[PDB]
Amino acid sequence: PYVRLGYEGILNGAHDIDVAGLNGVEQLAGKFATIGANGVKLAGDNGTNAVGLFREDLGDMVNASEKASFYFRGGEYYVNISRTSLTAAGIAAGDEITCDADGKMIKFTGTGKALGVVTHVGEYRAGNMYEKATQGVTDTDTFIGFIMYV
Amino acid sequence: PYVRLGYEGILNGAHDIDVAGLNGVEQLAGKFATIGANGVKLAGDNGTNAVGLFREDLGDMVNASEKASFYFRGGEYYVNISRTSLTAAGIAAGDEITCDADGKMIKFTGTGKALGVVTHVGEYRAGNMYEKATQGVTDTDTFIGFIMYV
Amino acid sequence: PYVRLGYEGILNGAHDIDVAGLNGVEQLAGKFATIGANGVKLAGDNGTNAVGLFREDLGDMVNASEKASFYFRGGEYYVNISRTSLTAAGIAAGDEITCDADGKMIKFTGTGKALGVVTHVGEYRAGNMYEKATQGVTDTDTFIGFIMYV
Amino acid sequence: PYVRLGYEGILNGAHDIDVAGLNGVEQLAGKFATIGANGVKLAGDNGTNAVGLFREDLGDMVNASEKASFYFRGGEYYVNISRTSLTAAGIAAGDEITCDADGKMIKFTGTGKALGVVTHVGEYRAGNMYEKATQGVTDTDTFIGFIMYV
Amino acid sequence: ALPVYDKDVDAKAFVISKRGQVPDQVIEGDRIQVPTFEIVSYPQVRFSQVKERRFNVIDRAQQRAKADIMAVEDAEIFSLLEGAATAVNAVTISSGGLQRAALTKAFQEVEK
Amino acid sequence: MSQLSNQEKEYLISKALETEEGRVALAQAMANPIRVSLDYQGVGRKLLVVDPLPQGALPVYDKDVDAKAFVISKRGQVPDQVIEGDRIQVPTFEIVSYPQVRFSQVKERRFNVIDRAQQRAKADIMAVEDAEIFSLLEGAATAVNAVTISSGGLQRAALTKAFQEVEKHDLVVTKIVMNASAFADIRAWGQNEFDPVTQHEVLQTGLFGHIWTADILISKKVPQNTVYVLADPEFVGVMPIRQDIQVIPADKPEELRLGWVIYEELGLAVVNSLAIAKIS
Amino acid sequence: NTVYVLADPEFVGVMPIRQDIQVIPADKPEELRLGWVIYEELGLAVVNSLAIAKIS
């Protein structure tokens, strides 16, 4: 949700990652969510959000997918439970967060499909809808952002 | 070992999925077959193996290969599993086709068959013992170019 | 279906095949192994093995959680159990993978278990367990002959 | 298992039998090497090594000295049946160790009445008895790991 | 990350980074005055300019360093900086006492 | 982003693209230069550590029961140790952004030495390592502790228990929180405890220096003759090394930076060094 | 340590501007005092900066 503030203006205002309660299958080993840099002391919406897929850092931190392009890794088996509040900039748990799903809804922007690359900025984008592909069941084409199912 | 025609695009491999026993469970995510380029999707004429000798690209596309992305351990064993008949068609032109890597007939040849690697005669054959990955079975055995059901 | 029945002569941890994994001992999806695809895979029954953390990529296909020769590609808590079937060994790529995330029969031991880091083959080796992928939290206290956890 | 020797870590690839005494049972527990008073910053690895001629020179500690041939007297042998691997390095703490001798039935070396002696580290050698000797005076039906009362 | 042996497998360590973009901002004010009022008051012309100028220089610093992150507000520095707390030292103690206590924290960083 | 986007409506920025300017990095204090360093060439180092020493029962007779002066030590063996970290980098991002390379060698070098120093001071040893300041040390008698405020007096008091052990006192290894807390208190009337208002650029008690680190757990301060207590042998000094034409770095579209030192640490005796917990 | 830790980039320096010739002065004689800057702020190493909050 927030593809309606998105369409190339992603990571402004409140965005969740969820429109429906996540599927089963707990993840074992707890860990924190933060999207900040040496602590989240970010309070209020806009700025860097923890929307997008995630990546494990030191395996003690999870954060948003903000790597380099090329050797990109597609789908992942969970998204973090929303702690999006106005005492935060997106999801960032100040306790340990434990995740779940078979994979769930995520947010994709760009002129790709459901899969892009990373420019070290939250979420994925990139062009080429014939060198990229839908994640999840059935073909879905991207034109203004949509919630793509892993 | 079972009746096969399939649809070859490279020499050897390809087989029927009409008789190939229990078919493995499909996973959520779609991806394209690289043949042609009519419309946004990639849609061309078949010219790809039906079953086995595929390698995943970057971009989340699947197509034929006799190459292995990894340098060590076993070979290809990425095979197509669908509920769609392959008997005059390969991987689907246009739209999302789902793959797996479990069951279906492959081809082994020569001595040994227990573990396999991939060779570039469109066939699989034995790799080294305690060094390389398994794909084959020591329950069905070859009669020299012979078709094993996994 | 399976490419053998599991052998427990795989050195230094990493034993069993799942009854039917995807989340327990009931229900399964096949999916391909590109575990250390690009890079040298480590021979099992030679190297320092263990069952590491594993990562989905390019949808619902799995590979190693690389973090030690690749610039934060993430990791996950949803693991690969690789086939100890026939004469294959430790982690292997070329297999059908049944996966878990709290299910069984997982093994979660071997060399460099606790005071360990994660290799660029998606295995554990020794070091220190406070950086570079967790060895578990309360799931670090599971040894041989006790019900292993992630 | 296998080859472990730690990492959680139970085999330990070394088995040394506590042979209970005769005419009322006697035991002695594996001894540490420490010079005088009790070892600080852990107590290190055992003074006793399977297949080695040691003598206690301290109450809870065992040390070097080699029993000299000529005129038959009691034990102080503390031969423990050989483990598999680590046979010219001694045996390290976290593997199986005991003491066997002195008021109990013991572990013997050498096959037939032809005997020779033992090195500390776990090796066997030839040698006639002429300035040192190990193990009791040979009897009928005496082989390696056989139970002689001394 | 503690040291480990040469007969035991070497320890590793890693750094993680996120990339950030900072856009430019414009701070500005206008103040509206009636010529009659201005001409007669005299120093009022100078004063109004110097105050509005001062006010803009305060508002640029205020946003960049502090504020909170909202839909019309930024906050760069405040977010990034590392935590430190007087409360560990004592909870309720003089204003003087806080400033003295506070000096010490900086040492830790190797600022001295 | 990092805070509200005001005008940028590009989120790509050409697969990353950045201009030459400072990249933020951590600097921490250490408990590593506190302990003395010297080089060693060999394959292992052997130390003696003092076990229990029997002073036995004091003179009361001659050749019935006699007192013992006997002190006992055991030898322990230390292997060469490795401290290392690797950082993996891709040339394209690095080349366009421009300071990343330089940032990465310094940030890496600092990061490892900092993490070592943190672990090394506090807490009991592991099974891959030996000698840690916290293990080596003894407590202190009930006397050092007071029920009247005087931060200076506690630290002073501690030195005298330490003297019996025969510590000549190099430096005091002190905690950032405790030291601050000592300042927050008052000497009743004017002034601040430990050292007063006017001096705070130099803090010295007993004619001895303070190295202030947070490595050690909170509420603990450690006086000692640091140079005797431990010694850090270095087999090879710190260097950055890069492999990119070696086998595994080659395979990647990437270059590998290695940052290592080959280290050791000896802990002499268990009755040298002294810990105290402050109530101020 | 303000000088190393942050730096102030200036796209435009602060400057007052004065305009007597716009829409509202035309309708009714009025004078406008204009005051503005265009700013950006650089952070050279901002994880050296410590923030503490007063209690009392």
3-state secondary structure chain F: CCCCCCCCCCCCCCCCCCCCCCCCCCCCCCCCCCCCEEECCCCEEEEEEECCCCCCCCCCCCCCCCCCCCCCEEEEEEECEEEEEEEEECHHHHHHHCCHHHHHHHHHHHHHHHHHHHHHHCCCCCCCCCCCHHHHCECCCCCCCCCCCCHHHHHHHHHHHHHHHCCCCCEEEECHHHHHHHHHCCCCCCCCCCCCCCCCCCCCECCEEEEECCCCCCCEEEEECHHHHEEEEEEEEEEEEEECCCHHHHHCCCEEEEEEEEECCEECCCCCCECEECCC
What is the C-alpha to C-alpha distance for residues C52 and C74, in angstroms, rounded to an integer? 13
Residue A118's closest CA among A47, A58, A32, A54?
Answer: A54
Task: Determine whether A47 is exposed, middle or buried from the number of CB atoms within 10 Å of its CB (0-12, 13-18, 19+).
Answer: buried
Q: For residues F72 and D40, is the Cβ–Cβ distance under 8 A?
A: no
Question: In Å, how far from its chain's centre is CA F24?
Answer: 24
3-state secondary structure of B124: strand
Identify any residues that bridge with E29 across adjacent strands, giving them in sequence order: G35
> Residue D87 is encoded by which pair of tokens?
């046979």
Among the partner residues E80, E93, E97, nearest to G46 by beta-carbon distance: E80
Length of chain A: 150
Residues of D in contact with C16 (CB under 8 A): none
Question: What is the chain E residue with the closest CA to A90?
Answer: E69
DSSP D50-62: SS---EESSSSBE
Report whether A54 contacts A63 (CB < 8 A): yes
Rg (CA), chain F: 25
Distance from CA of G1 to the nearest CA of E (A): 7
Nearest to G46 by CA among E62, E76, B110: E76
Task: Give the CA angle between residues F206, F135, E106 to the nearest 5°.
Answer: 55
Identify the H or E element spanning C121.
Answer: none
Triad G1, A42, E109: Cα angle to 5°:
30
Experimentally, the structure was elucidated by cryo-EM
Looking only at Cα atoms, what is the longest distance across chain B?
A: 47
Q: CB contact, 8 Å: A69 with chain E? A: no
The sign of the torsion formed by the CA atoms of A97, A101, A103, A106 equals negative
User: Closest approach of chain B CAs to the CA of C65, in angstroms?
Assistant: 15
Tell me how close the Cα of A39 comes to any Cα of chain E, in angstroms: 7
Rounded to 10 degrees, the C-alpha dihedral C134/C135/C141/C147 comes to 120
Structure tokens at D47: 């003074």
CA dist F3 and B129 (Å) reads 57
The two structure tokens encoding residue F191: 């002034």
Computed on alpha carbons and rounded to an integer, the radius of gyration of chain A in Å comes to: 14
For E89, which of F3, F29, F181 is closest by C-beta distance?
Answer: F181
C62: helix, strand or coil: strand
Q: Which two tokens stand for residue G5?
A: 């830790």
Q: Minimal Cα–Cα distance from F68 to chain G, Å? A: 56
d(CA F156, CA F168): 14
**Dist. CA B26–CA B22, nearest whole Å:** 12
CA–CA gap between residue C45 and residue C110 (Å, rounded)? 11
- E97: enclosing H helix or E strand: helix E95-103
Residue D138 sits at φ, ψ, to 5 deg, of -50, 150
With beta carbons less than 8 A apart as the criterion, state whether C89 and C30 touch.
no
Q: What is the resolution of this structure in A?
A: 6.1
Question: Are F230 and F266 contacting, i.e. CB atoms less than 8 angstroms apart?
Answer: yes
Contact B35, B100 (CB under 8 A): no
**Phi-psi group of F126: left, alpha or beta (phi > 0 → left; psi -120 to 50 → alpha; rest → beta):** beta
**Mode of pairing for the β-strands spanning F209-212 and F171-174:** parallel
Task: Give the position of tokens 């101020």.
Answer: F280
Residue E42 backbone zone (phi > 0: left; psi -120 to 50: alpha; other: beta):
left
Instruction: Give E-chain residues touching A92 at CB under 8 angstroms.
Output: none
CA atoms of F8 and A12, how far apart (whole Å): 11
Cα–Cα nearest to F267, from F60, F41, F18, F76: F76
Query: From residue C43, how far is each of B12, B130, C46, C61, D85 by CA, in Å?
Result: 30, 8, 6, 22, 22
How big is the C-D interface in CB pairs under 8 Å?
Answer: 34
Cβ of F166: how many Cβ atoms within 10 Å? Answer: 11
Cβ partners under 8 Å of residue C61, min gap 6: B27, B56, C31, C32, C34
CA-based nearest residue in chain F for residue E3: F83
F15, A11: Cβ pair inside 8 Å? no
Pairwise CB contact (< 8 Å): C68 & E14: yes
Between CA F221 and CA F178 the distance in angstroms is 8
Residue type, B21: G
Chain C residues whose beta carbon lies within 8 Å of the beta carbon of residue B130: 43-46, 87, 89
Inter-chain residue contact E10 with C127, CB threshold 8 Å: yes
Which pair of tokens denotes residue F233? 């042998």
At residue A122, what is the residue type? G
> Cα(A20)–Cα(F118) distance, rounded to whole angstroms?
44
Q: Which residues in chain F touch residue D36, judged by CB atoms under 8 angstroms apart?
A: 51, 72, 74
* Contact status of A48 with chain E (Cβ, < 8 Å): yes
Residues 6+ apart with CB under 8 A from B73: B131, B132, B133, C35, C41, C43, C92, C93, C94
Q: Could you give the C-alpha distances from C148 to A85, C19, C51, C145, D41, in angstroms and in order?
A: 37, 15, 11, 8, 32
8 A C-beta contact, residue C88 and residue C110: no
